Paper text:
For the structural analysis, we incubated wild-type recombinant hSKI with a 25-uracil (25U) RNA substrate and the nonhydrolyzable nucleotide analog ADP-BeF (which mimics a prehydrolytic ATP state). Cryo-EM data showed that essentially all particles were in the closed-state conformation, resulting in a 3D reconstruction of RNA-bound hSKI at a global resolution of 3.1 Å. The cryo-EM reconstruction revealed well-defined density for six ribonucleotides (N1–N6) bound in hSKI2cat in a single-stranded conformation. hSKI2cat has the characteristic domain organization of DExH helicases: a pair of RecA domains (RecA1 and RecA2) contain the ATPase catalytic site and are juxtaposed to a helical domain, resulting in an overall globular shape with a central channel (Ozgur et al., 2015). The 5′ nucleotide (N1) binds at the top surface of hSKI2cat, where it engages in base-stacking interactions with the so-called melting hairpin of RecA2. The ribonucleotide chain then binds along the RNA-binding surface of RecA2 and continues into the helicase channel, threading between the RecA1 domain and the helical domain (at the so-called ratchet helix) (Büttner et al., 2007). However, the cryo-EM density of hSKI revealed an additional and unexpected feature: the most 3′ end ribonucleotide interacts with the wedge segment of the hSKI2N domain. In particular, a Trp-Gly motif (W146-G147) in the hSKI2N wedge segment contacts the 3′ hydroxyl group of the N6 ribonucleotide enclosed in the helicase channel. The interactions suggest the presence of a crosstalk between the hSKI2N wedge loop in the gatekeeping module and the 3′ end of an RNA substrate while in the hSKI2cat core, rationalizing the presence of a single class of particles/states during 3D refinement of the RNA-bound data set as compared with the different subsets of closed and open states in the apo hSKI reconstructions. In this closed conformation, the wedge segment in the gate binds and occludes the exit of the helicase channel, enclosing the 3′ end of a bound RNA substrate.
Numbering used by the authors:
A (entry chain A): 1198 to 1246
B (entry chain A): 550 to 648
C (entry chain C), F (entry chain D): 1 to 305
D (entry chain B): 1036 to 1564
E (entry chain A): 1 to 50
Write the structure that this text describes.
RNA sequence: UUUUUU
């Protein structure tokens, strides 16, 4: 639950660093997000599919 | 508490009031008595087959290492007999199968 | 903010060795959904995605060495395959039996591509030309010529009138099928290309070279609209979605990415394969992706519209 | 280059950059004297002595091209006399030394390079120069040892592993298995070294033979195909593919299931030639590759059975150029295949012609072995022996090792076959003895020991020594199936000669614990005579 | 070259086996085929120059 | 009368080329003192220390490329050797008969070390795994792995439940043998290691570096309690003695230095071995020292307790 | 010692 609640905040910071004008935080938060969601932590819910 | 639950389930199986939802108030006790109950086997053979087919079809999407680790195996063992636990400290993929 | 992507089915061991190419065809007017795959064998197995799973239908085979390219047709039930065997034998897909066999060596064919109307079956040669054979009508009416090197990738625009060809060493050539005259030659990348694709309505040509970049050119001029760099090794295929908004790329770093051309960014990455991924395709109304890999497996994903 | 020369013309050539560029364009086109003049002119106006050393090295290279190695050498020493060497003058000096077949200055240059230069970070070029120096002296085992030393120092560096595999394929191809492992390691440790590493591991697998568990998905054919998919540009992959197809046919024939992959030799030859045409320059290597590919294609076509195509291919090649004594032998071989396939006697005129043609191209053990086979076919045994002997003498002088063992074993087979016929002039066993002793002197050839067993059994059939030798051949493990079966079969017949049913059933269980059809069936046939 | 001819009995005994020697690879590895014919080495011209 | 460390022997040509691994086994309490060396010529030679000298017992073989590591077992008389083609042999050491031949794939094993009761034979791997092959009975019993680079050197704790593994990048991983759960990761250096040694009553761990430094660590923590700066060039091998008093080191600058933990200074330095030294070892007590260099010479020094 | 969301 903590990892799921972090990969969803390191993605609204990708949206705010693009708004402030920080293109190096955008390129680091867009990496820290894609390396954080790979496996059973992000398994699709049975109900949804 | 182990004898209390086995005497309750003995008086509960004699009648048809079987699908009983225990409400515990802390997760360690919650998985503790589900581990400690350890012999009911309330399920027939065809229910064994359907439980096994459904759980294998839903669990066989994900990869190798992720499908043999302690909770998955332990919960599958309990579910085989027809028992589940549903506290807040288990993977959502197991809450959804139990539900 | 992205959508819900995910696996639906996983064939465990389709062939006995690496799988080198895949084609998905919604050929029949009804819901057939036939998938044809070729491997480092003689086998050209013909699968069918019926409702929720793939059931093997044909295991047809006549080849001697590994198959390097397979193709399917949208009008007729038919398929074509080429190999290191110097033969282009084209199958039937209905009774599972060979129809023809064309003799052509690594100097006459490397990779296959049918016409939009399933009539011509162009292939790329070694000496630089593109050879256009004739299905059901014999062999080798004419060959387009580009004064270049070994040619790896061949693409046909969906509406006709355009044929594109990548090569070892990078250069890209665009011909028009109407007259057979070279429109213009792009200089592109600096390493082999080995995959190309137009977009539906044919105004956007997407390459994928050996250095990791994905150029997005624009047809009818020489404009390029950007360079997509998000892989970590070679890029081996690019398939463009039925609606002109996304495309899928499989690389030799064991990863299938889904891009969108509006903002030139990667929406979702699939980390499910365990070895090089040699083939990706969409299906009909593009909402599922097939991916054949170096480890013998067939993945089918779910990309909701 | 002409456009470049014209462009450098339309400027005042007064700064170092313009003069240097002009010099390189001039050198590229030809015109070595002009490039030398321009490089000297650039040398006049020079600061930053690194550039002075580089210009001196360029001068040495450009005049070397014309010839005049003496002046190039002195100019490179002059460059060395500067305050600090550049690691580029040293490398050029080593290569210049290697271009002249003398290791005196090359060793000195290499020691100088190693001594005080560590900021170079290639680590592959130094190994290549060191190995080339050792190969110059003809050592040919030290080379591999030197590369093994280099790989021990830096167990990373895919390049080093790949080079070790290549060297094992070229020099000392008796560590074929180790070479296969080295190529596999190089391919694993990256992806972009796939091309060369797969080529070299495939060639090593060809050299090895079939020394595996008959496992699929890792045979020579599979690896060469993987390499062909990775890079379809070099001519070596196509030549390797031709060799792999022929070897697979022979292995299937040994296993006796089915020949497969029959007719593609002409297409592969076309691919090889087309691919060579676009390679810039390794002239000797390209010529060698094309010659080997042509010969292999003709032989493959003869074996599969398409005699006519082989004939037309050879004739076209001779129609291209005046005769070269290699291809004419191929034409002779294709000519003389129908005849002697059906029993026939050949006339001394044709036979003498063939012998004369073979002397044309000497220094080739294959040719001599083929001629000896022809003599044996008609039956002129002693002449066959002489031809085989010439091949052995030639092979031993060349330092090769496979040829020596092949010739010796072939001669032993000749003598054993002559003995089989119950011929008088009891001298063929003596020849068998000498050939087999030399064969065992080289190695541990199972065929040689079975051949001795057959000689012992045939000559002085006897009771004890023959059975002992045969049983030793057939009972310790680590022997091929076919050889074990033949020794087993003769031992069964001889063991039946000196009746002991117990021992015969022991032989039966030995057959049972393996797979056989013929020993036990013959035993069934001969249990009730 | 001394004899110029040899006459031998080709089916000397029909029980025994003729010896067919097949050569596999450059490192010494031989095998015995059953049916009679030519020696049939593998890679007759040697390894391809790589 | 001071008994100073003396050279006491030289054997001019033990092998035909460089020598790479040396092991000293006092298995027999009687005069056996077996010394075994592997040397790049594909030969493993067994020598014995008879009265004052080395007399060769036998040279035994079967190895494709140079031999990289040899080990001698304390409990039983038995030897083990690995080479560059990742192929492991076990030697009888009474007849020279190759008890067992543990094979291995292209990337399985680099160096070797027995278990204290001589049962497991742990080995490193080109891609980071530390898989263990049970002696004389089993193959690949299990594979304890981390994520990391090439792993040059591997040590085994004398008492047990510890296994320290250096890496080419320069980091140390220590695993408890009970379950396989990594105890703690030490950053180490920024260059490869090439040697790791514990102590009897194993509380101190000594690491050799490729920069010439030697680092002392305490097993209970990651306390970098030491640093020694005498060797000029790389350091290749470090060994202890049967008492926790001092250790020997073998640089690549053709020098063998004997350091002490108590005072952290070089009590003595040896000047032999015209070319660089690759191995050093101590016998069943502190008396005698064995060194094998790149030049084909074995040296046996003396160092009173 | 229970429970939770942008």
């Amino acid at each position: 639950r903590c990892i799921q609640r972090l990969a969803e905040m390191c993605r609204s910071l990708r949206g705010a660093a693009r708004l402030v004008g920080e293109p190096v935080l955008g390129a680091k938060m867009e990496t820290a997000a894609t390396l954080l969601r790979r496996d059973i932590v992000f398994a699709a819910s049975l109900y949804t599919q | 508490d182990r004898g209390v639950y086995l005497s309750l389930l003995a008086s509960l199986r004699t009648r048809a009031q079987l699908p009983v939802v225990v409400f515990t108030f802390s997760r360690g006790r919650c998985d503790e008595q589900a581990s400690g109950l350890t012999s009911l086997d309330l399920t027939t053979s065809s229910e064994k087959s359907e439980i096994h087919l459904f759980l294998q079809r839903c669990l066989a999407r994900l990869r190798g290492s992720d499908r043999q680790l302690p909770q998955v195996l332990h919960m599958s063992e309990l579910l085989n007999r027809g028992l589940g636990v549903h506290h807040s400290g288990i993977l959502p993929i197991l809450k959804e199968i139990v539900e | 903010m992205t959508n819900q992507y995910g696996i639906l089915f996983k064939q465990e061991q389709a062939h006995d060795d690496a799988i080198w190419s895949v084609a998905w065809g919604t050929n029949k007017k009804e819901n057939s959904e036939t998938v044809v795959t070729g491997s480092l064998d003689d086998l050209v197995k013909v699968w069918k995605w019926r409702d929720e799973r793939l059931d093997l239908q044909w295991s047809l085979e006549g080849h001697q060495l590994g198959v390097v390219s397979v193709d399917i047709s949208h009008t007729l039930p038919i398929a074509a395959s080429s190999s290191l065997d110097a033969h282009i034998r084209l199958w039937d897909l209905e009774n599972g039996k060979q129809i023809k066999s064309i003799d052509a060596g690594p100097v006459d064919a490397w990779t296959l591509a049918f016409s939009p109307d399933s009539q011509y079956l162009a292939t790329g040669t070694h000496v630089g030309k593109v050879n256009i054979f004739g299905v059901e009508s014999g062999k080798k009416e004419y060959s387009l010529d580009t004064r270049g090197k070994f040619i790896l990738s061949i693409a046909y625009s969906p509406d006709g009138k355009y044929l594109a060809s990548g090569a070892i060493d990078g250069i890209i050539n665009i011909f028009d099928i109407a007259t057979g005259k070279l429109l213009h030659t792009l200089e592109g990348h600096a390493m082999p290309i080995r995959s190309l694709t137009f977009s539906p309505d044919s105004q956007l040509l997407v390459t994928a070279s050996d250095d990791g970049y994905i150029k997005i050119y624009d047809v009818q001029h020489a404009n390029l609209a950007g360079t997509l760099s998000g892989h970590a090794s070679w890029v081996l295929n690019v398939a463009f979605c039925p609606d002109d908004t996304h495309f899928v790329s499989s690389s030799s770093d064991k990863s299938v990415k889904v891009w969108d051309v509006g903002t030139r960014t990667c929406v979702h990455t699939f980390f499910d394969h365990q070895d090089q991924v040699w083939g990706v395709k969409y299906n009909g109304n593009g909402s599922k992706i097939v991916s054949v890999g170096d480890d013998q497996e067939i993945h089918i994903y779910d990309c909701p519209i | 280059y002409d456009k470049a020369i014209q462009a450098f013309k339309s400027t005042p050539l007064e700064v170092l950059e313009d003069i240097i560029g002009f010099a390189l364009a001039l050198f590229m086109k030809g015109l070595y004297k002009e490039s030398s003049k321009a490089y000297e002119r650039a040398l006049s106006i020079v600061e930053s002595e690194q550039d002075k050393a580089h210009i001196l090295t360029a001068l040495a290279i450009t005049e070397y091209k014309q010839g005049k190695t003496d002046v190039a050498k002195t100019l490179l020493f002059k460059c060395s006399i500067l305050k600090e060497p550049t690691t580029e003058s040293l490398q050029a000096l080593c290569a210049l030394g290697l271009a002249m077949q003398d290791a005196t200055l090359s060793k000195a240059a290499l020691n100088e390079l190693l001594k005080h230069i560590k900021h170079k970070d290639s680590n592959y070029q130094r190994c290549l120069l060191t190995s080339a120096i050792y190969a110059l002296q003809g050592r040919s085992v030290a080379v591999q040892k030197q590369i093994s030393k280099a790989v021990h120092s830096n167990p990373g560096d895919p390049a080093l592993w790949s080079l070790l595999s290549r060297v094992v394929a070229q020099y000392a191809q008796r560590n074929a298995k180790g070479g296969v492992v080295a190529g596999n390691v190089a391919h694993i440790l990256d992806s972009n070294h796939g091309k060369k590493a797969l080529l070299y591991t495939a060639v090593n697998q060809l050299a090895m033979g079939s020394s595996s568990a008959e496992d699929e998905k890792n045979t020579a054919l599979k690896t060469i195909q993987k390499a062909a998919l990775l890079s379809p540009g070099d001519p070596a992959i196509w030549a390797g593919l031709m060799a792999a197809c022929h070897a697979d046919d022979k292995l299937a024939l040994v296993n006796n299931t089915q020949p497969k992959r029959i007719d593609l030799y002409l297409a592969l030859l076309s691919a090889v030639s087309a691919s060579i045409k676009d390679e810039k320059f390794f002239e000797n290597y390209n010529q060698s590759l094309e010659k080997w590919s042509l010969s292999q294609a003709v032989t493959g076509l003869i074996d599969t059975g398409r005699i006519s195509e082989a004939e037309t291919l050879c004739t076209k090649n001779l129609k291209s150029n005046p005769d070269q004594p290699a291809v004419i032998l191929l034409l002779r071989q294709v000519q003389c295949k129908p005849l002697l396939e059906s029993q026939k006697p050949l006339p001394d005129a044709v036979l003498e012609e063939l012998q004369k043609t073979v002397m044309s191209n000497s220094t080739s053990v294959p040719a001599w072995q083929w001629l000896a086979h022809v003599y044996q076919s008609q039956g002129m045994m002693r002449a066959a022996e002489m031809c085989y002997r010439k091949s052995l003498q030639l092979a031993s002088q060349r330092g090769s090792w496979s040829g020596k063992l092949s010739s010796l074993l072939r001669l032993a087979l000749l003598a054993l076959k002559v003995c089989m016929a119950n011929i008088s002039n009891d001298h063929w066993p003596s020849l068998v003895q000498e050939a087999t002793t030399e064969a065992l002197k080289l190695c541990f050839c199972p065929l040689a020991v079975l051949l001795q067993a057959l000689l012992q059994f045939k000559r002085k059939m006897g009771a004890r020594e023959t059975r002992r030798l045969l049983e030793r051949v057939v009972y310790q493990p680590g022997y091929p199936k076919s050889i074990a079966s033949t020794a087993r079969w003769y031992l069964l017949r001889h063991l039946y000669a000196k009746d002991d049913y117990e021992l015969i059933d022991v032989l039966v269980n030995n057959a049972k614990t393996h797979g056989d059809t013929r020993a036990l069936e013959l035993n069934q046939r001969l249990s009730s005579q | 070259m001394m004899e110029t001819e040899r006459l031998v009995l080709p089916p000397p005994d029909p029980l025994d086996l003729p010896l067919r020697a097949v050569e596999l690879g450059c490192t010494g590895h031989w095998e015995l085929l059953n049916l009679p014919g030519a020696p049939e080495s593998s890679l007759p011209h040697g390894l391809p120059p790589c």
